[PDB]
Symmetry: D2
Subunit: 384 residues, 4 copies
Amino acid sequence: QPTAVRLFTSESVTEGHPDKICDAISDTILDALLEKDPQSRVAVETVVTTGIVHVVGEVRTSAYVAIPQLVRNKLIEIGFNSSEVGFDGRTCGVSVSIGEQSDDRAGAGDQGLMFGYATNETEEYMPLPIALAHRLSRRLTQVRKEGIVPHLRPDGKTQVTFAYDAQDRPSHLDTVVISTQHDPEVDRAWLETQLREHVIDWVIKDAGIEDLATGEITVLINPSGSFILGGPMGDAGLTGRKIIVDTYGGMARHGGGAFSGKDPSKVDRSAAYAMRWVAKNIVAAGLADRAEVQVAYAIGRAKPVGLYVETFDTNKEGLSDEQIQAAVLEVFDLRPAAIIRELDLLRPIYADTAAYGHFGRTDLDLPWEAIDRVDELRAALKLA
Amino acid sequence: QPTAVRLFTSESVTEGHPDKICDAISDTILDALLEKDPQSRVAVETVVTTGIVHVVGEVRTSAYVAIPQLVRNKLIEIGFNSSEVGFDGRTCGVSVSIGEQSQEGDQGLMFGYATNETEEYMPLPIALAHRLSRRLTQVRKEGIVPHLRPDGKTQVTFAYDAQDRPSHLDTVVISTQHDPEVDRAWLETQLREHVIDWVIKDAGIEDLATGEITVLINPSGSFILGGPMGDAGLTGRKIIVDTYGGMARHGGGAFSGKDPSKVDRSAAYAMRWVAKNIVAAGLADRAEVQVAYAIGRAKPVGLYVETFDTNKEGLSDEQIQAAVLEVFDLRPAAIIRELDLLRPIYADTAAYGHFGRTDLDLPWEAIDRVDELRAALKLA
Amino acid sequence: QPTAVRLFTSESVTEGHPDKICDAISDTILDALLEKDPQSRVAVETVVTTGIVHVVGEVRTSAYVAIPQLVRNKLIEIGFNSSEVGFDGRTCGVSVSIGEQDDRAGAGDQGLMFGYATNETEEYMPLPIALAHRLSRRLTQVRKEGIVPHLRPDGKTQVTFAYDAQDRPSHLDTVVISTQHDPEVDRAWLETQLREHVIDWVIKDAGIEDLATGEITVLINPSGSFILGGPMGDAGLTGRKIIVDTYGGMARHGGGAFSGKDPSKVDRSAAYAMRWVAKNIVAAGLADRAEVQVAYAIGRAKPVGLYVETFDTNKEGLSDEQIQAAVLEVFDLRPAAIIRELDLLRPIYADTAAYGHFGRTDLDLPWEAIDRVDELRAALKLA
Amino acid sequence: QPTAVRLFTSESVTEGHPDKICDAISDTILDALLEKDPQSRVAVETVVTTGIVHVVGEVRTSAYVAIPQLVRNKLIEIGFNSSEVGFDGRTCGVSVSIGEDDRAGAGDQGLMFGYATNETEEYMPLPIALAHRLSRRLTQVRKEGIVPHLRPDGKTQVTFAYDAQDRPSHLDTVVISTQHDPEVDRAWLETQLREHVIDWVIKDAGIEDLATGEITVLINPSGSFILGGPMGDAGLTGRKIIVDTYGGMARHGGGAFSGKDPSKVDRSAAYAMRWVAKNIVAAGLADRAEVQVAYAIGRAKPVGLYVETFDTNKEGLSDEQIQAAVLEVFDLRPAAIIRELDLLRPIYADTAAYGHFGRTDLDLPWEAIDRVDELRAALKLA
Ligand code: NA
Ligand code: NA
Ligand code: NA
Ligand code: NA
């Protein structure tokens, strides 16, 4: 009969976290190939460790791109420009092991399952915990790049814990954790003041979540102390190792597939994008407050072998999940070629997705964020 | 308004799938180090592509292990023993970039899950997908089905009812690497009998497999070359296969190549242990628990119990969570001690899933806290 | 006092020896770049070990070449096409770590380079390296043409001649051949097959029966089986067979490797020039044997050093100092003038990357031209 | 018929030259293995390029050594400690791809040469002796703070006018190219290196009499040298074999030394040939001696031996007669060379720059003139 408060957590990382460096390098190569050959087939994985970038996988393309210069320039853009910060794009190892050799009916290029999610609890239709964690990691990068907080270095991680009510909804911000790389000219006591003011307080006001941040918020800035070296130094990063940061921060189920370094023919990426597009339209059409949708494919088959709509008893208009799914099946063509055509995916738009999340990005104009199927869904259900 | 039937999917892969090669290599090095030094700190990632294995990361150990031999022997066990099958443990590249000292971590979120819909407390789609991929490897190694090669994938789709429960098997996909001596039609007859039919009987789900089942065997034609050749693999790229096949939420953390001091592993194991005890204690049919840690704090900063309205005994999820907090010590050091994690038990976990393994004796599968939970809740 | 017979030895290796695999890959990349962009700057090193090729260095080029496919195809042509032979171009690792960013032009580096020639063979080569190369080329030939079955690519040849008191070859003393093979054949079977189809064939093809009379020691796979070959348990690197590539130890060497270097690298172009000089000195009748050193300073076109030696074989009462004045009159040794006069900006180099850079009767290499004999004689006012 | 002056050149490089980085790393690994297990079989090649060290090859040892730490520590000792200088041992990539009685046969075939000359007190040719002294002094003035603003990579080269008798007569040209900080230019380096490297070494070597009159001195003649080492100049083990030996004065069989334990005849038989050549000259049998030796895989006794003394042979002896004395005194089976020179000791990292021969700063067993008595006594001499 005693009760505990349920506490839900999501995390994000900056573009200088070693796994995110790999995602960004993988999608920088994808975009360079797409800019010159929109039909490029790309399955490029990046590995980073002390002093090393290793790029591996398979491309089919008519484009020429200078991979080592793309890698070095992306590391410099992130801010790894010196041995003093743990990694230097100008002087690091770059090794390439890429193999270059061997319409809606086109079969899926692999089996797999993919989920999409949306909720009207934020303007960007994202869960509050991942939305706040991404806003904090984006702001931590912004204050470094613009000099709002001097003496910062690229690597960093954010983590937010909300209290939740008995109906599975956020009630209150409980705990914020931020860790940032920094120059030795500053110490943790200075960083605590700077990041509390210029990151956390700024983001709470920018997100309009004052109501959720009243009273005692536990804040931990660089709780382990000095954070001088970072990125790949004394560590390792790999493409596709931040797939929950990339999506919904653990609020939504995930099918396992990574996004970065994959062209749009990979259903792991394009069908996940299609499921965000479906979920967002289900919510925007007023059929549910929250919606999660699974799709699944068999290799060589165009039509999904599976589709699974869940709205967690937030369904509206007396509609069941089974009725909403029938409307989705009428309105959306989930054959992989039809997804690529309707969302105009064969464009170099992916390097921007490789840090700070693929979904609910109001800084970007991503096609899977369009709420342009609201009218068709409502009409399929005979709603006004 | 019209209704559609909800279809939920899970997948698994054989030990020959390039990503699972990487998980196994990472956990084989981990086990070799734990055998000689239980206190070893290990953060090893494996990358495979045409002709090469690259092992990267950091180890803090007193143990001497010969990594190139361990890698070669592991590929040969998997069955990659010839250029003919596309990869050879004896003749492939092995490159090691592991730091052993500095010379000049308890954070993140984790989920556990259990359901009483199977005897092993797993969701049916992932339990069936793992039984198919394990059985596909077995029929090769035993020569029950000849002319198979190690790489393969399985996928299972179940119809679900309006209450989010499985109602019947809909679709089975098996894709297997094979010798050029055989084709898709031959694999269809062999695999329907010796893999699909055999597993439906072995699992006792005949009543879920009546009527029309869609079976897709090598649906995209021949699959002669596989493993790393034209299909790069990395450690920790099968984290949904490793866990609950998409039935349960995930925190993002990979298991393989990580020693037990890493909460991405130990805390996810602890949450399986908590979820399984909640369901075994008759508090819920299905339970999902998130935990989360803040750097420098031993006790978790977050815990979140969800039983999807399957609550029993008139208990809310908040009440179940208070009992969990009284019964379970969720400090990482206490998890390591209570589950006796500092043992070379992990290479076995690196394919066919970390949870609900009837073939293994894993400490996070113990339902030894049921009496404590029921006593904390004043139940009989 | 007791006397001993002096015995001089030279060696060669097949195209399948791991060091020569690297030389070949490095020069196959160079040739592919020079084919589409003759102005390409290339400094590409190849490393082979079990399962992997790693290509490293720096290139400046407008050309696109697919390096992984070039590597795999070259390994296939050499005969490494299966895990059973120890290496497979189709399935091996290939990793690339290459960065991509008139006559008065200075040398790109310092360094010293030697050239040599001797009228003891028609190709102007010392007999010990001439014979070692013929054996290694023949060893490759009997495999590719299947004159001797069950052979695998990796092999080494070694020839030891007795020498007279005046430092000239007198007779063949010892021939060594180690060849990679299928496990179906043994040392005993290789010994019969290789004596007939390689050693006896070459002696006849070279016309050296007069030097191969009496008892010759023949050691064929003396260490036993040689089944696993190539990079598998024997790492290779570009520029680790520089004495095989040149005069087999008969002539001095400046230390510079040839393969993976475009002609702007004096290590290559100036060694080629010294061969051309040394060959023309002997062809012009100034000496029987000539060895010439040249050296450069980075950023300076004219050499800092030139040294002629003829080993007291000088003719016409001319000193080495007199022959050298003639060489300075006739030859422009500025790097740009060497590239121009020998037409070096062509894809001709992969051919050079095994069986030697000099004395090649199977190739038409510009540095083997005896086209300056009139100019040398006219400089010495010889008829 | 006019005359030109013959001009002979040799070069050396600092320990910061990318090829010598690879030799030093290969021999640092060999030494660490021999320290714990003298019977270690080692064939370790090092490759360096922008940001990366790759160590490949084969070891058979009972020894555990921490290879990445050895690599990083060696780069730090060399001076590559910053991205600013082009390479940092603390932050660079390190990848390892290593696979793990006296009639004992040669492990390989091949030919090896040794050389000695009484023209210097260390029995070395003057051009390579002077090139090595310059490269060692260029390192010393940087490490000791005699000349500021230097960086590790550098090359030296000397050209001597030679007489009709093939002997050095005059120092003609000295080249030094050094890596440096951007705060200094060629003009400053020319002043500093003329005094603290060139003039210092001419006095240290006692060759003032060869260095009179006009000497062409070329310091950083190609201009600025800010980045160096592996960045834009890939290095490999065994790519400075002529710098390692006699600077082109002597013939060479092709075999590299570094990264090889003493069971490799490429190393031990070249060491034996220096030992033989130096004792021939120390015994008073010749002013200059060059000796080839050659082996066949599977056989202990050499298949070839060749003595050349370039007409400097004394006491009415021919090279055929010197060679018979050599065969009586010297056991040239590999196991016998390893035994007599006590080669199974961690002495090799010190040989990996500044040459393997004529090293008055080391006490190398192959430099011993401990066999002159046996040679004289086998030739029936006083
Ligand atoms: Na539901
Ligand atoms: Na709930
Ligand atoms: Na002479
Ligand atoms: Na002589």
